[PDB]
């Protein structure tokens, strides 16, 4: 499993996106396009932009 941390807040605009807060711990499901699929601490999933998260 790969953990990434949110660099910035992101507000979901589409049902398949995920709301994230800066410094939130996330798990990376798919990094093969510019929408990255992530999972949060409560096992909700969705897409966030690649530039919003990084491996610490």
Residue numbers in the entry: 2 to 57
Task: Paste lines from the article.
Nck proteins are composed of three N-terminal SH3 domains and a single C-terminal SH2 domain (reviewed in Ref. 3). Nck recruitment is required for complete T cell activation, and its inhibition dampens TCR signaling by reducing Zap70 phosphorylation. The objective of the present study was to initiate development of an inhibitor of the Nck/TCR interaction, specifically by blocking binding of the first SH3 domain in Nck (Nck1-SH3.1) to the PRS in the CD3ϵ subunit of the TCR. During our studies, it became clear that Nck-SH3.1 exhibits conformational diversity and can swap half the number of its residues to form a dimer.
We thus determined crystal structures of Nck1-SH3.1 both alone and in complex with a CD3ϵ-derived peptide to delineate precisely the site of the CD3ϵ-Nck1 interaction. The apo-form of Nck1-SH3.1 (residues 4–59) was crystallized at a pH of 6.5 in triclinic space group P1 with two molecules in the asymmetric unit. The diffraction data were phased by molecular replacement using the SH3 domain of human hematopoietic cell kinase (HCK). Residues 2–57 are well-defined by electron density, whereas the remaining residues are disordered in this crystal form. As expected, the archetypical SH3 fold of a β-sheet curved into a half-barrel is conserved. When superimposed on the NMR structure of the Nck1-SH3.1 domain, the root mean square deviation (RMSD) is 1.2 Å for the core SH3 residues 5–57. The side chains interacting with CD3ϵ (black lines in Fig. 7A) are in similar conformations as in the NMR solution structure. Superposition of Nck1-SH3.1 with the crystal structure of the HCK SH3 domain (40%/68% sequence identity/homology), reveals a similar RMSD of 0.8 Å. For comparison, the two protomers of Nck1-SH3.1 in the asymmetric unit superpose with RMSD of 0.24 Å. The largest differences are in the two N-terminal residues, outside the peptide-binding region.
